[PDB]
């Protein structure tokens, strides 16, 4: 038995599967540069941690590698049951608030190094955690898709750390007895997406869809298709920054104001911006908490040691 | 702050939380007077350990009980996200191989109790575990069901320690590629059942659904729709000892014959009966494999301690 030593938690409801020891080395490089070697050599053992049956196809994994640079706390690769991510908002809460629990960090600020830069976290004294994440934009606004069964619908393309089509006239209800019909809708959409061969910058995939919906009790609540097919228990932090990039360049959100964002099950996250330069700066807070300590177990006399299905 | 220990096993790719330390007293009475007592006044400890976050939809818990018998390795009560089970085949397989892995038991002939009855296990050589179950039989034969969209179709009623409506020409392909319209399929029947006020033995309520097929490796490929909407990922022991009473009734399978059923993923259970007195007695054997140590932490400043949803 191989074994995968992980802090599980979750924020707002969407998990995080810490891994903290059992992985292959994967060298020195660039967080970017280990996440190539890792899908190229090591896929595998992805799929072992998050897939069925020792994961969930919801289960979002984080491993936790070590920093190039001095002032860093950490570096993290976040994957789920279908690839890779970018950067990963409820993820980073997750990591934050685990390395807390394991008595590695203080409250304060720590740089945390990703795939797609380094963001900052704040630890609070209430232990929430806010990330200064890498800068976001929007990078085309109302695109047309025919949507058939349901006809036209508009959504912008931009960029939180992940890529991301947005849409505010879907006509959808957004509430947790309702996700099998998001699922669906959203499902439908990207497929309209890949028809018409509409991408993010340099042919970047849009790999996530949000629904977005009036709320009475925030300003906004969504439902969020993550690449896998599953549903983001979360507000979603790279989906959020996505949000705030296209609030203001509609002029409907300035430097420094807070918005606050509902999940598809009620958890929310309170989010604004800065400006530095031409650049948009979204922060994103809110609060994890630990689920449980783990070592996963892998039987090599085990037919799905490396997980279930296709 | 409160803690769940437990050891997470698959049986065929489906799941047993085996819970051996956290959960509230229950008492010294029978393994069905503590279920009485769980459900009724510690339910939240079945949502906290088996739903969202810290458990999935598909998971299945044993809660590991002190028997009353002297001579009786353990007690077992199962739960699910919808509410209780009776007997559980994989479950039963998942708990003996979890207390071998806990050098509790070695290989042999053990005793548990459950809330339908006691079950007899035998851990072998290689680890699988054999489960003489309680005893099974049909209760109604080739019942008329008219399925809206489809129409119309013919099943079984039958007890194998859970009540099941077994079902042959359905006309659905049983793939896992195709569990979403399978889940459909099967959720409709129940519905149909419901509406023409069919139940089991005196008034029993029909909660497991399961569909039959060819296999070109096995007897039988089946799909089985737990109480809860989750598929089993195995064969389903209690659905495979409904299915040999069925088997047996109309004249297909004498006893000590083996069968061997194949579940929606693939995964497989060898099968017979022994007939004593005008009783079936179903006997099962499979292989579970470890999937993690895990201690489940119950933060009271989490909103979703005790689990999400409905
Ligand atoms: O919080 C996020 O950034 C995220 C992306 C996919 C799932 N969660
Ligand atoms: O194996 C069984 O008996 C079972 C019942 C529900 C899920 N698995
Ligand atoms: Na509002
Ligand atoms: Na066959």
């Known amino acids: 038995m191989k074994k995968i030593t992980v802090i599980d938690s979750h924020t707002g409801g969407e998990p995080t599967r810490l891994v903290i020891d059992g992985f292959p080395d994967l060298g020195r490089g660039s967080m970017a540069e280990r996440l190539q070697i890792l899908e190229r050599e090591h896929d595998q053992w992805r799929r072992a941690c998050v897939l069925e049956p020792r994961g969930s196809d919801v289960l979002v994994g984080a491993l936790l590698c070590q920093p190039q640079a001095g002032d860093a706390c950490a570096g993290v690769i976040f994957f789920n049951n279908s690839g890779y991510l970018g ?46 994440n890498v800068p976001a934009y929007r990078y085309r606004t109302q695109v047309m898709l025919q949507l058939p069964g349901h006809g036209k619908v508009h959504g912008d393309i931009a960029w939180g750390g992940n890529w991301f089509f947005l849409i505010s006239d879907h006509g959808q209800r957004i509430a947790l007895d309702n996700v099998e019909a998001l699922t669906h809708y959203t499902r439908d959409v990207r497929q309209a997406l890949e028809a018409a061969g509409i991408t993010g910058a340099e042919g970047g995939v849009i790999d996530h869809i949000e629904l977005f919906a009036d709320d009475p009790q925030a300003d906004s609540r969504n439902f969020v298709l993550c690449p896998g097919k599953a549903y983001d228990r979360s507000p979603c932090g790279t989906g959020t920054s996505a949000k705030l990039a296209c609030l203001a360049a509609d002029g409907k959100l300035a430097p420094g104001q807070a918005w606050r964002q509902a999940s598809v099950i009620g958890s929310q996250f309170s989010a604004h911006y800065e400006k530095v330069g031409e650049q948009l700066i979204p922060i994103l807070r809110g609060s994890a908490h630990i689920s449980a300590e783990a070592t996963l177990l892998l039987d090599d006399s085990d037919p799905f040691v490396w997980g279930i299905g296709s």
């Open 87 to 132: 950067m990963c908002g409820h993820g980073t809460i997750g990591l934050v608030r685990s390395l807390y629990h394991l008595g590695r960090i203080d409250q304060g600020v720590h740089r945390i190094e990703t795939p797609v830069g380094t963001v900052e976290a704040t630890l609070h004294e209430d232990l929430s955690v806010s990330v200064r």
